[PDB]
Design a protein around this ligand. Structure first.
Ligand SMILES: [Ca+2]
Ligand SMILES: [Ca+2]
Length: 287
DNA sequence: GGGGGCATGCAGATCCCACAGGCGCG
DNA sequence: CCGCGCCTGTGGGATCTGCATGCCCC
C-alpha cells in the first residue's frame, strides 16, 4: 500500500487506461467504467493506484492477468475530478471528454428517458471503436471525427508514469561479424500508435535527444521513439527517471538498466568478468 | 415488485514491448 | 579496421476494449 504522484498516475493512464461506456438492451441499460488490465507481475501498480483514488475493485482475469475496475457512479467523480486537475495527453483525452459528458447525462438522471440514450449512443459512436452492428442498426440516425487532441509532454512526472506503461529499457548484445567481440548497447524506446505522432515527436525537444522511426504507411500504424547514443542515455535519459521514479516492474528494469550503464561508463564491459554480469543483467529482465 | 445499479465474470482486437540486422561514418 | 549508432524491420502477447449476466436493493 502506497500512493503515487498524480502526474505519474495520469501518465500511466495515458498508456494503459481505458474509458468504457456500455449500452446493452427495449430496456437499454448503461454502464460507465474506467478499467486497467495488466500482467500479474504489475499488480502493485493497480493496488498503488487504488490506494491513491480509494476506489475500484482489483480482480484476477485468468492465471496471468490482474484487472482494476471502477464502475460505481459516485466513485467515478473522483476520477473525473482528478483528470480535470491532471489532464490526459494522448488521444485518450478525447475518450475522456466523451466519458465526462456521458457522466453528466447520467448525473441529471436523464440517461433513462428516451431523450437520454439517444445522446449517449451519439456520444458512444465517437469514443473508442464506436458502436456495434446491432445498435448501429438500432440507431442508423446517429449524427455527430471528434476534435483531435494535440498536446506535448506536460512534465517529466507524466513521462515516468507513461514510460512505466508503453516504455522499454533493454540491453543489446551484438557479436561483431568482423571482430567476434561482444558489443554492449543500451537503448530506450517508446512505441505508440501514429495517432499521437505529434506527442511522440515532442519527446525529442523535451528530452534533448532521440529519433522517430515510422515505416511505410501501408504496413504499420504505430511508430517508435528511440534513444541509442550512449552519451544521451547516460546524461539525459537516466537523470530524468532518477528524479521521476518509475512504477511497477519498469522501475526494476530501469535499475538493472542503470547498472549496465555504469559498467560501461567504467569501461568494465570490455572485461570478461564485467561482460558476465551484464549477461545476467540481461536474463534478470526477461524473468 | 422490479428497475436500475453494482459486482463479476469471459473474450475479442491490437497496440504495444523487446528486440534484430545492415551498414555508413568518424 | 573498429566500435558507435543511425536506420530498417518484427514476433507475439500484454495489453486496450467489449459483451454478458445473475444478484441486490430500494
Ligand atoms: Ca498504450
Ligand atoms: Ca505495459
Amino acid at each position: 500500500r502506497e500512493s503515487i504522484n498524480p502526474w505519474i498516475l495520469t501518465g500511466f493512464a495515458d498508456a494503459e487506461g481505458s474509458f468504457g461506456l456500455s449500452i446493452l438492451n427495449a430496456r437499454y441499460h448503461t454502464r460507465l467504467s474506467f478499467t486497467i488490465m495488466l500482467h500479474n507481475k504489475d499488480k502493485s501498480i493497480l493496488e498503488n493506484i487504488q490506494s491513491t483514488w480509494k476506489v475500484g475493485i482489483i480482480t484476477n482475469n485468468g492465471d496471468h492477468y490482474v484487472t482494476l475496475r471502477v464502475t460505481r457512479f459516485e466513485d467515478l467523480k473522483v476520477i473525473i475530478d482528478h483528470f480535470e486537475k491532471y489532464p490526459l495527453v494522448t488521444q485518450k483525452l478525447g475518450d475522456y471528454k466523451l466519458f465526462k459528458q456521458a457522466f453528466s447525462v447520467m448525473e441529471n438522471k436523464e440517461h433513462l428517458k428516451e431523450n437520454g440514450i439517444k445522446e449517449l449512443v451519439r456520444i458512444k459512436a465517437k469514443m473508442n471503436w464506436g458502436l456495434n452492428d446491432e445498435l448501429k442498426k438500432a440507431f442508423p440516425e446517429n449524427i455527430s471525427e471528434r476534435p483531435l487532441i494535440n498536446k506535448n509532454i506536460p512534465n517529466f512526472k507524466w513521462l515516468a508514469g507513461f514510460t512505466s506503461g508503453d516504455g522499454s529499457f533493454f540491453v543489446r548484445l551484438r557479436k561483431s561479424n568482423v571482430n567476434a567481440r561482444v558489443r554492449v548497447q543500451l537503448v530506450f524506446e517508446i512505441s505508440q500508435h501514429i495517432r499521437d505522432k505529434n506527442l511522440m515527436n515532442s519527446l525529442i525537444t523535451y528530452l534533448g535527444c532521440g529519433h522517430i522511426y515510422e515505416g511505410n504507411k501501408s504496413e504499420r500504424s504505430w511508430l517508435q521513439f528511440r534513444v541509442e547514443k550512449f552519451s544521451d542515455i547516460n546524461d539525459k535519459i537516466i537523470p530524468v527517471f532518477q528524479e521521476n521514479t518509475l512504477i511497477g516492474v519498469k522501475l526494476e528494469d530501469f535499475e538493472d538498466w542503470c547498472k549496465v550503464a555504469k559498467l560501461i561508463e567504467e569501461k568494465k564491459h570490455l572485461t570478461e568478468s564485467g561482460l558476465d554480469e551484464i549477461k545476467k543483467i540481461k536474463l534478470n529482465m526477461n524473468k
